[PDB]
Each structure stands twice: as structure tokens, then as C-alpha cells.
């Protein structure tokens, strides 16, 4: 159905009315989202169907129609924009300077912006508009606030 | 059955609302893709 490049909402009619479970990026004919949003299930786009192609529960990422296409990375210095697409509200760019998630396997950028769980899959962008990762997988701090990692896949 | 709806273009917006802090957090990632706080 609709394969135009851009940010999309991931919806469901299983619960009461229509509910936004997440968000994703359509790029180069491939739909990219977080695994916990779809659980690997097929998606509908108008009258067309999007079947999963690649997924991994640990990276919490999934691609539809083709392999992961997003390859840009945060440079460790610059501010970034979270293109937040929240449930029932318009898409909105929120600029922030990312912090760090220090892990046993290396450092990862992290955005400290709080949004509902249905915002999962919202793209994080660099100054050229390139997707450097997706928002939706992180942790809950002392504050009760949510700090998400800048989760990026690997392009083959 | 899940479905998708376009929500906009992927562009950088000059003069966007600049907010949010930059914390350095010690974390762990389990086999189920869940992060946790190491203290
Ligand atoms: O719960 C959230 N994310 C998530 C859920 C289930 C799983 C994973 C991540 C990875 N393994 C399975 C979440 C995402 C978000 F954008 C804002 C949030 N505020 N409180 N929780 C959130």
C-alpha cells in the first residue's frame, strides 16, 4: 500500500477503539520499528501487507519488506532531535543533548525525554535529518522518568 | 491485526523546543532486550 518514505504510526483495533502501540520509519521500501511494538507480527498498510524480514529481541528491532536500512550514528558530541510521534497528538521535533548508557559491551547514546509507551519506534535524527536510532528501549530512573537508548541496527 | 498510518516527514527542524538532560547511567542488557540499572 503506502511505501512513501517518512514516519508512521503503528495502530491496533484489538483493544477499545483504535490504539497506538508504536511508531516506525519507512525508508528505501523497508519499514523499521522496535520488536516490542509488533512482536514480529505482520502489518497492514491500506490494502497491502508488510511481512517481517529481520528481527532480534535483544537489539529490540524489526524490519519489514527488506533488511535494516538505517546506518547513521550519533557522533558522541552533537545535539539530536527526537521526532516524537505520541498517541493522539501530532508529530513533534524535540531537540536534546544525549547522555550515555555505559554497558559491559560499550557506551551507547541515550535520550532523556519522557513519552508514553505508544511513542516507541520514534526516530532520533542528526543535523542532516538522518536516522541515528529509535526511541523506546531504556530504563526507569529514581525520578520515575524514562531514559531511552539510541537503538540503531546494522546495515549489511 | 496491526496497521500503519503516515505521520509526517523525517526532517531536522531549526528552532525546535530544546529540552532534556544528558545523564551518564551504568546499565545492563539482559537476553530479553531489557535494560536495568546497575548501582
Ligand atoms: O516499556 C517501554 N519499552 C519497552 C517495553 C517492552 C520491551 C522493551 C522496551 C524491550 N524489551 C521488551 C517504554 C517505552 C517508551 F517509549 C516509554 C516508556 N515509558 N515507560 N515505559 C516505556
Explain what this protein looks like in three dimensions.
The complex is a heterodimer of chains A (156) and B (39). Chain A has 156 residues and is mainly β. In chain A, a hairpin with a 2-residue loop joins β4 and β5. In chain A, strands 1-2-3-7-6 form a five-stranded antiparallel β-sheet. Chain A is globular and about 45 Å long. Chain A has one helix and 15 strands; from the N terminus they run βββαββββββββββββ. Chain A has two domains: 59 residues, Thrombin, subunit H (Beta Barrel); 70 residues, Thrombin, subunit H, CATH 2.40.10. Chain B has 39 residues and is mainly beta. In chain B, strands 3-4 form a two-stranded antiparallel sheet. The radius of gyration of chain B is 17 Å and the shape is flat. β10 of chain A pairs parallel with β3 of chain B. The structure holds the ligand O=C(Nc1ccc2c(c1)CNC2)c1cc(F)cc2[nH]nnc12. Ligand A1B8Q sits at the interface of chains A and B. Chain B: It is found in: Host endoplasmic reticulum membrane. Chain B: It is a multi-pass membrane protein. Chain B: Required cofactor for the serine protease function of NS3. Chain B: This is Serine protease subunit NS2B. Chain B: Forms a heterodimer with serine protease NS3. May form homooligomers. Interacts with human SPCS1. Interacts with non-structural protein 2A.
Question: How are the SSEs ordered, and which strands pair?
Answer:
The complex is a heterodimer of chains A (156) and B (39).
Chain A: E1 6-12, E2 19-27, E3 30-33, H1 35-38, E4 43-45, E5 48-50, E6 52-56, E7 61-64, E8 80-84, E9 92-96, E10 99-103, E11 106-111, E12 123-125, E13 131-134, E14 138-140, E15 146-149
Antiparallel strand pairs in A: 1-2, 2-3, 3-7, 4-5, 6-7, 8-9, 8-12, 10-11, 11-15, 12-13, 14-15
Chain B: E1 2-8, E2 17-18, E3 24-29, E4 35-37
Antiparallel strand pairs in B: 3-4
Bound molecules: ligand A1B8Q.
Amino acid at each position: 500500500g503506502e511505501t512513501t518514505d517518512g514516519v508512521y504510526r503503528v495502530m491496533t483495533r484489538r483493544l477499545l477503539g483504535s490504539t497506538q502501540v508504536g511508531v516506525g520509519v519507512m525508508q528505501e521500501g523497508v519499514f523499521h520499528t522496535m520488536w516490542h511494538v509488533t512482536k514480529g507480527a505482520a502489518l497492514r498498510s491500506g490494502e497491502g501487507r508488510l511481512d517481517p524480514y529481520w528481527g532480534d529481541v535483544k537489539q529490540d528491532l524489526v524490519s519489514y519488506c527488506g533488511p535494516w536500512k538505517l546506518d547513521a550514528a550519533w557522533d558522541g558530541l552533537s545535539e539530536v532531535q527526537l521526532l516524537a510521534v505520541p498517541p493522539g497528538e501530532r508529530a513533534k521535533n524535540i531537540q536534546t543533548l544525549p547522555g550515555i548508557f555505559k554497558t559491559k559491551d560499550g557506551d551507547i547514546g541515550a535520550v532523556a525525554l519522557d513519552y508514553p509507551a505508544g511513542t516507541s519506534g520514534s526516530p532520533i535524527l542528526d543535523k542532516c535529518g538522518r536516522v541515528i536510532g529509535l526511541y523506546g528501549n531504556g530504563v526507569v530512573i529514581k525520578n520515575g522518568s524514562y531514559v531511552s537508548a539510541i537503538t540503531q541496527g546494522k546495515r549489511e | 491485526d496491526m496497521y500503519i498510518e503516515r505521520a509526517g516527514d523525517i526532517t531536522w527542524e531549526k528552532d525546535a523546543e530544546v529540552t532534556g538532560n544528558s545523564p551518564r547511567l551504568d546499565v545492563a542488557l539482559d537476553e530479553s532486550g531489557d535494560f536495568s540499572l546497575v548501582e
